[PDB]
Amino acid sequence: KRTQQMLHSLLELCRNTNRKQAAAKFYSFLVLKKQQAIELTQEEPYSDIIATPGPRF
Amino acid sequence: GFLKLIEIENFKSYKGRQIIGPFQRFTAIIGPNGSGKSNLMDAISFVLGEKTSNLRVKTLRDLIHGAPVGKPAANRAFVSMVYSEEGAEDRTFARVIVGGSSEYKINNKVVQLHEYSEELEKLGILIKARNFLVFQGAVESIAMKNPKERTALFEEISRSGELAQEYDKRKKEMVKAEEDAKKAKQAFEQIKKERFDRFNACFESVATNIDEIYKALSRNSSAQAFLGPENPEEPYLDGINYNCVAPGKRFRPMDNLSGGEKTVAALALLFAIHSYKPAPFFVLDQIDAALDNTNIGKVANYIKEQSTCNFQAIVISLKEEFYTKAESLIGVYPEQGDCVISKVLTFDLTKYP
Amino acid sequence: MYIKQVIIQGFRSYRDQTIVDPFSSKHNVIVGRNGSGKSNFFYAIQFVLSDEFSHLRPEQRLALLHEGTGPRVISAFVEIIFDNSDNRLPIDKEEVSLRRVIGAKKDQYFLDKKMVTKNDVMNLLESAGFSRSNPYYIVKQGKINQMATAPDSQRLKLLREVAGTRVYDERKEESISLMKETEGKREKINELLEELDRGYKSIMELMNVLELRKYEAIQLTFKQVSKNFSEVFQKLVPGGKATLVMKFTGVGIRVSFTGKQGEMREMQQLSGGQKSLVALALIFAIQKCDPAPFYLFDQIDQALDAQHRKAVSDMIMELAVHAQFITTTFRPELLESADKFYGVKFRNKVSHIDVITAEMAKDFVEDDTTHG
Ligand SMILES: Nc1ncnc2c1ncn2[C@@H]1O[C@H](COP(=O)(O)OP(=O)(O)OP(=O)(O)O)[C@@H](O)[C@H]1O
Ligand SMILES: Nc1ncnc2c1ncn2[C@@H]1O[C@H](COP(=O)(O)OP(=O)(O)OP(=O)(O)O)[C@@H](O)[C@H]1O
């Protein structure tokens, strides 16, 4: 899965591309934590969210 | 007006006092299945005075975090929203509940039902409007039923349907008055015009609008919308037929109509009922439901250059070519615990090239 | 059974013949523009092997003609060729063929180009293992959701008439109906006081022995569709533990997967992230418990996201060994698990059939190449 592929931050992931693949990668990044695979949380309104591979990687 | 900040307390997959915002003109959101994304729309609908009788709740006790399993996080849970617009009124609304009792708040004060109405239609939305409130499969729902129910729902939106249950009982007995009376007849066209000038006024408006709406969705000349009334003097007594001629077809009835186009017709009808007393903000979920990628780009462009005048838009989508071009990609993500919880994080596609 | 190929002539959107590559062994995909004609193919199949589109008054069946680029065609042809690799057909025929011509009034049939009429084709269809009474596995558009938003009542009727005992609850309550208002007759005679009293006992005894096998026959499929449902759902979801429960009485659907904390709720009070799973799971429960000659799916991937596609495609790629599954897709993840790929285009008011290759499927429908 492309979500598992990214195991190999996210702004640098989604920088040099159009909204298409940038947003696809961001969406998969958000999805893969559905069962706590990474750790991430945004308390501030609008800025970066940092996550690293965790329990299932 | 533009919406900025939203505060939630103790709803489905919503544990914590999270404040959410700000927002923009056309904000899109995407996430995993069952990520509480539809619960955002549930909160938006509830904070604006929902019926609270059709939201998976018995009366008020199943609308709490883990409520219909027997483990509510508390007996109280509430939303507050920040509405900012012209007139320098950056006000806030709030819907709170304790036990089986509910309470309204306008800028943190006690508010009852009819006062909420007199301040709500001030915003331009009727107590029985519910016009723009979308569902996960709303665009797959309105088309299937017979036209009579569409007539009923399109007549109840103009403060008219609340007296049909007494107008219907008028006619069949007045024949006896005809058989022998005239005072009642001379007063009987009063309710007749109370129906006509109240319903047909918006009826003709939406009938005119649907044409350019379907065009803006498709820009196909042969693709034309037609809300054909039957017996226009008493149209709501029967069904009102619809004909959404696709670009490659002709005028065809609703019987042998292809399913894959009912989504576009339903969206056009949504924007048509929008044309009648529009709401300053839009909610959309699962726009890539049954509409293939062919028309998804046209639809997405139609909204994101259609909602730049007075009303903003909130949308959920899945197909790639949509978020190839949108301007905001906010997200909500789940997390485990004693039950399901969700947390809000914000990226905007405007920064994405 | 084992579908080989189809031929369509002027059915709804195909004014031309449809000689293409024969359909593959296990599963194939259909891709194309919205309104291209993919669904029309499935109504063509349903029409050629079910009467639900051929039992109405002879007005709409004329609209069941093709009216795309010209006037109404007085005659249209539909036929399906199979391959009796399993000796399913009672008649010793290597290549099973069914055919119907629709006209102004003619709707007769041809088995292997043999003249056959209405009753003498349904008799063989019933000997061929098909459920006319409830059209299983020809689930049409919007099915996965129509069973979903609605209460226990329609799921009760769905299960109980895919079993199929409609006459039974049409007459059991009618027998019950007269026993209600006639209680005064007994009591008036009871006030007067004779054989009818033991007759009332006889009524209860005969009704009970009548109901003995009816509900038993339901349990002759209820427990089967229940036990595999948990098994198939556990196969779909590594934590999956969805079950059915019994209570005339109602039933209950319940779901449990990967949560283990509080996620034991009924899907009626659940959002749309599981309704399609419950649907597909019950169809696959019928799959395993009650095998069918083939399986036909429409828009079974309308609501959920690609996470569900991964698991469902992984499961289907292995379940294909049971029988042939046919569906329509718009995304490549589940398209990648098909033996062959097929597509539908639309030119000059007429559909166009063409077997699409892998190199053409995984690029045209992924990148938006729309126009108009
Ligand atoms: N019966 C219920 N009782 C309590 N909470 C519920 C119940 N049903 C659903 N929920 C809550 O609602 C959430 C549903 O998620 P969400 O709102 O994202 O779904 P959806 O958008 O309708 O689904 P889809 O992924 O098909 O678009 C669950 O995770 C849970 O927190
Ligand atoms: N009475 C009719 N006569 C001729 N063509 C018709 C008639 N009714 C519908 N059609 C055609 O059927 C087509 C439906 O094609 P299709 O099977 O692809 O359905 P869809 O659900 O709209 O599309 P998709 O499966 O791509 O999502 C329509 O585009 C229309 O041109």
Coordinates of C-alpha atoms in Angstrom, one line a residue, chain A residues 9-11 26 29-30 39-51, chain B residues 333 344-347:
Chain A
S9 CA 7.1 15.3 8.3
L10 CA 4.8 15.9 5.4
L11 CA 5.4 19.4 3.8
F26 CA -1.6 13.9 3.0
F29 CA -1.0 10.0 6.0
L30 CA -4.1 11.0 8.0
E39 CA 1.4 10.0 16.6
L40 CA 0.2 13.5 15.7
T41 CA -2.1 16.3 17.0
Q42 CA -2.8 19.9 16.0
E43 CA -3.6 22.1 19.0
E44 CA -2.9 25.4 17.2
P45 CA -5.3 26.4 14.4
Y46 CA -3.2 26.3 11.2
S47 CA 0.3 25.0 11.0
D48 CA 2.3 21.8 10.4
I49 CA 1.5 18.5 12.1
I50 CA 4.5 16.3 12.8
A51 CA 4.2 12.5 12.9
Chain B
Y333 CA -8.6 11.9 12.4
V344 CA -8.9 18.2 14.1
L345 CA -5.9 19.3 12.0
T346 CA -5.8 21.9 9.3
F347 CA -4.0 22.1 6.0

